[PDB]
Design a protein around this ligand. Sequence first.
Ligand SMILES: O=c1ccn([C@@H]2O[C@H](COP(=O)(O)OP(=O)(O)O)[C@@H](O)[C@H]2O)c(=O)[nH]1
Ligand SMILES: O=c1ccn([C@@H]2O[C@H](COP(=O)(O)OP(=O)(O)O)[C@@H](O)[C@H]2O)c(=O)[nH]1
Lengths: 124, 124
Amino acid sequence: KESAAAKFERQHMDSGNSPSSSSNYCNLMMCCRKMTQGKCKPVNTFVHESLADVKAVCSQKKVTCKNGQTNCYQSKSTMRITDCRETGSSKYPNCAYKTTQVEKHIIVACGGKPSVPVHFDASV
Amino acid sequence: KESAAAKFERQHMDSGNSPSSSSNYCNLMMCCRKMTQGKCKPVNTFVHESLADVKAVCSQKKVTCKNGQTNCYQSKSTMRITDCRETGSSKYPNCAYKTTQVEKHIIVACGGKPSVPVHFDASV
Ligand SMILES: O=c1ccn([C@@H]2O[C@H](COP(=O)(O)OP(=O)(O)O)[C@@H](O)[C@H]2O)c(=O)[nH]1
Ligand SMILES: O=c1ccn([C@@H]2O[C@H](COP(=O)(O)OP(=O)(O)O)[C@@H](O)[C@H]2O)c(=O)[nH]1
């Protein structure tokens, strides 16, 4: 069971950062979205366009998936995204990331009926 | 089991204009620090000072806790803190927070051995 001291540190301590630390976006988001459990997911992209716009990519340009699957689609326009990449100094369970703001076309794999994004393949 | 569509939304979607803005600090932190699981914690403060400085409060000015417990202590000096307060628009599981930065004395409950902060009581 989590100690009261550890609980206080979790709920109330942020010694290493401040709200103005914009570079801290990936650290917090990778944590929030449960991609730092068991191991640090080394690379992950968040998309800041609407869900509707990202869903619409499944009806846009058909392209080769990096893994050779044939259900990938490239966005018709660039999108505002953030790449989160684990730093060389990063070490589990303290997963540290570099935050890179980018505007590139995205490639997603689509699946299901209706066909919706299921995997982020790449930016180009 | 988490659907593929939902997994993509969790891993790859953060729709919005200024994702890394200081205004989003509480949204990110309250999620990462596990205070939005089950329900939105309505009010929470993060402290930007060193753990040593916060621990030092346990040997400073004794004050009664808001709840009548007798193990609270007030910091002799002000500390850099961030208050996170639920917005009007906020409703679980879409917890939404207003981020406000202030410099105030903190009041914490101290417990255990060594006596360390275990609860954040108030700022003054
Ligand atoms: O630009 C990228 C590249 C990869 N990924 C994620 O990283 C995972 C796999 O990483 P990558 O393809 O780079 O390495 P590999 O699959 O060869 O191990 C994928 O599931 C994606 O979710 C991402 O979010 N953005
Ligand atoms: O300035 C504050 C006041 C409250 N809290 C947190 O909010 C919880 C309860 O809030 P409070 O006692 O102030 O009001 P209550 O919810 O009991 O009516 C506490 O456990 C604290 O962790 C906080 O972080 N900062």
